Design a protein around this ligand. Structure first.
Ligand SMILES: Nc1ncnc2c1ncn2[C@@H]1O[C@H](COP(=O)(O)OP(=O)(O)OP(O)(O)=S)[C@@H](O)[C@H]1O
Lengths: 375, 50
């Protein structure tokens, strides 16, 4: 008859858990109700300091202003060009703020996905080693390049026929150093406006200047590059100014440091000679179609995780393979799997490879002119 | 660079009806019409070239 302890503890534990969770809800709404009344502030940048009390700032939204600090704003922090906060009404300076990020950078900074490293690509062991020697060594050990006393090369240009894996080599670097790959696709830059693209270029170059080991990567340049015109369409004017933004601030007077620019194109014949000189892009690095041993290497790289039997004359497939791509023999293995699912074999027979090779032969009877050497 | 192998993968052309698919297509679109069926469609497919 002593079960009243269990009943009292039941009601008290029910009420205690209810009070804990309900006062936790009331406390969350209490903090979110306390935080209601605050008022936002104005983002502006410091042009210059006028006097000890006077400060010349220009916000991004329009005109210029002259105000002063509050009490404890520590005026030596305000270097000319810092981004600060302003009141909406009183308009004086509130708090020094860190610099902007412009999340167009972030959508091409964080959005590196995973990948397999440079053992996945192959047959082009010149360029792999050579890009390593020209990039990784003057950023890991600069004294090898200072004992000689010769300035390191800055810009590297990948070029060649389409489909040689010009993208995936930089992607392998993006799975090797993993440091600050700002892979700009260089087509989603221009949107509609007047000087927005120039400001994005300034933003990228400031951000690369600060985070000292940055890798600049601009794929498919020829859209934003061009060469020059006799002044035809009006949007091409701002195109050429957007290009001359890069032409100045890649070189300027303030030289870049550790700002390594990796460049790739579909046809390098249409670039501007303003961009084609060394200094900006130092060494032209050429990739071409795989040879017999190279086709063997890529084929046996793709033929690794494919369910088949010990019958594969790789020499036959590479023998019928003639002047192909990174993706051609990938398409060979893919269509080999396709022909495997054709007639439901559940392994890949060796004749499916010959069928896929003749499918590639059907494909590349519609393509030509694969030799664009610049200059 | 629009194709190369596998930007688009399966390169598929479209043939024209050789002979028999002509009568097939005539049968398909004439399925809705009411026909007094004194018609060899194979005559018509055998005369209408290309
Ligand atoms: N030699 C290779 N070895 C292994 N995989 C390769 C090789 N070449 C190409 N690939 C693969 O095929 C893809 C082809 O990449 P691409 O997009 O053609 O590079 P790219 O510079 O964009 O070429 P274009 O001119 O735009 S078609 C790569 O992403 C790899 O997955």
């Amino acid at each position: 008859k002593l079960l009243e302890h269990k009943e009292i503890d039941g009601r008290l534990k029910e009420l205690r858990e209810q009070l804990k969770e309900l006062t936790k809800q009331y406390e969350k709404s209490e903090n979110d109700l306390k935080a209601l009344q605050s008022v936002g502030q104005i983002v502006g940048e410091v042009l210059k300091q006028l006097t000890e009390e006077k400060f010349i700032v220009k916000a991004t939204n329009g005109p210029r202003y002259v105000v002063g600090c509050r009490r404890q704003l520590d005026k030596s922090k305000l270097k000319p060009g810092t981004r600060v906060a302003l009141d909406m009404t009183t308009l004086t300076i509130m708090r020094y703020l860190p610099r902007e990020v412009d999340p167009l950078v972030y959508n091409m900074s964080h959005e590196d996905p995973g990948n397999v490293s440079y053992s996945e690509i192959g047959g082009l062991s010149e360029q792999i080693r050579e890009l390593r020697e020209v990039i990784e060594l003057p950023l890991t050990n600069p004294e090898l390049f200072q004992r000689v006393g010769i300035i390191p090369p800055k810009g590297c240009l990948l070029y060649g026929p389409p489909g040689t894996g010009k993208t995936l080599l930089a992607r392998a670097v993006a799975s090797q150093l993993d440091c600050n790959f700002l892979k700009v696709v260089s087509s989603s830059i221009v949107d509609k406006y007047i000087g927005e693209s120039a400001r994005l270029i300034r933003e990228m170059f400031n951000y690369a200047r600060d985070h000292q080991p940055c890798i600049i990567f601009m794929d498919e340049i020829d859209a934003i590059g061009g060469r020059r015109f006799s002044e035809g369409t009006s949007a091409d004017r701002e195109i050429q100014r957007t290009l001359m933004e890069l032409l100045n601030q890649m070189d300027g007077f303030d030289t870049l440091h550790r700002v390594k620019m990796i460049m790739a194109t579909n046809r390098p014949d249409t670039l501007d000679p303003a961009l084609l000189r060394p200094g900006r892009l130092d060494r032209k690095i050429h990739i071409d179609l795989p040879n017999e041993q190279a086709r063997l290497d890529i084929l046996k790289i793709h033929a690794g995780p494919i369910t088949k039997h010990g019958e594969i004359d790789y020499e036959a497939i590479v023998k019928l393979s003639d002047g192909f791509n990174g993706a051609d023999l990938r398409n060979v293995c893919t269509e080999a799997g396709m022909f495997a699912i054709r007639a439901d074999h559940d392994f890949v027979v060796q004749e499916d490879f010959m069928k896929a090779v003749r499918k590639v032969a059907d494909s590349k009877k519609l393509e030509s002119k694969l030799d664009y050497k610049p200059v | 660079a629009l194709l190369r192998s596998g930007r688009l993968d399966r390169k598929i052309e479209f043939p024209m009806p050789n002979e028999e698919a002509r009568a097939r297509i005539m049968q398909i679109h004439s399925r809705k019409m009411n026909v007094s069926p004194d018609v060899n469609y194979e005559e018509l497919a055998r005369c209408t070239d290309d």
